[PDB]
Amino acid sequence: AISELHGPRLLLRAWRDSDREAFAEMCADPQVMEFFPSVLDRAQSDALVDRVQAHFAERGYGPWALELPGEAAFIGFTGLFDVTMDVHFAPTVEIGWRLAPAYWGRGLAREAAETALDFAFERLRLPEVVAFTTPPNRRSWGLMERLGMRRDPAEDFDHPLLAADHPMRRHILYRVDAARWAER
Ligand SMILES: CC(C)(COP(=O)(O)OP(=O)(O)OC[C@H]1O[C@@H](n2cnc3c(N)ncnc32)[C@H](O)[C@@H]1OP(=O)(O)O)[C@@H](O)C(=O)NCCC(=O)NCCS
């Protein structure tokens, strides 16, 4: 009973068993995982999918699996996750994305994000959605600003689920509220 969402090219859907092999491939790809602490093995990949499925069961939304009808069953994920950790901007909802590298440079993460944010603001009627990443991950924060999200550098933060001296602790914060989304 999870609502599927449609874009011109994409289907945002609940995950299925068959997705885990392809997602595991992505999670083991160093180019996909470049700006994370490490690649994931199959157990870790599967544990992430378990958390995704749990979020969908609890909330009715989550990071949707991305299908490309006419092309491919699974190309990654894009969608919403509730922010509950001890950060200055909690509680809120974040958007995130991960695409297999063959699908980069096609506006597919852009389209998936637009579709997820339309859900956020039209259906859920959320006040705001945030996103966060590390400064080196230009492809990621680039997409955040192209969507119309905006960053205040004064809101940079250390990730509370990483060590206080973790090399990748420092994150940047983008925000988009309902009014700004509507004004695009
Ligand atoms: C972050 C990520 C999803 C971005 O994907 P992406 O394909 O670069 O993003 P978009 O969908 O916005 O596509 C943008 C590119 O497509 C091009 N483009 C082509 N057709 C397009 C269209 N119809 N609409 C928009 N852009 C289009 C743009 O010119 C741009 O190219 P460029 O990177 O050479 O400047 C992807 O790089 C990824 O999965 N990275 C690894 C995982 C990760 O780090 N996630 C973030 C953790 S915070």
Curated annotation (Swiss-Prot):
- Membrane-spanning regions, if any? none
Occurrences of domain N-acetyltransferase (ranges): 10-179
What EC number(s) is this enzyme filed under?
Answer: 2.3.1.-
Q: Which InterPro entries match?
A: Acyl_CoA_acyltransferase, GNAT_dom, N-acetyltransferase
Protein keywords: Acyltransferase, Transferase
Gene Ontology terms, MF aspect = acyltransferase activity, transferring groups other than amino-acyl groups
One Pfam family here? Acetyltransf_3
Q: Does the keyword Phosphoprotein apply?
A: no
What SUPFAM superfamilies is this protein classified in? Acyl-CoA N-acyltransferases (Nat)
- Stored PROSITE patterns: GNAT
List ligand-binding residues for CoA: W97, R98, L99, G105, N137, G142, L143, M144
Q: What does this protein do?
A: Catalyzes the transfer of an acetyl group from acetyl coenzyme A (AcCoA) to an acceptor substrate and releases both CoA and the acetylated product. It prefers the peptide Asp-Phe methyl ester (or aspartame) and the peptide antibiotics polymyxin B and colistin. Other substrates like dopamine, serotonin, puromycin, chloramphenicol, D-glucosamine, glycine and N-alpha-acetyl-L-glutamine are used and displayed lower activity.
Q: Which PANTHER family match?
A: GNAT FAMILY, PUTATIVE (AFU_ORTHOLOGUE AFUA_3G00765)-RELATED-RELATED (PTHR43792), N-ACETYLTRANSFERASE DOMAIN-CONTAINING PROTEIN (PTHR43792:SF1)
Name under which the protein is recorded: Acetyltransferase PA3944
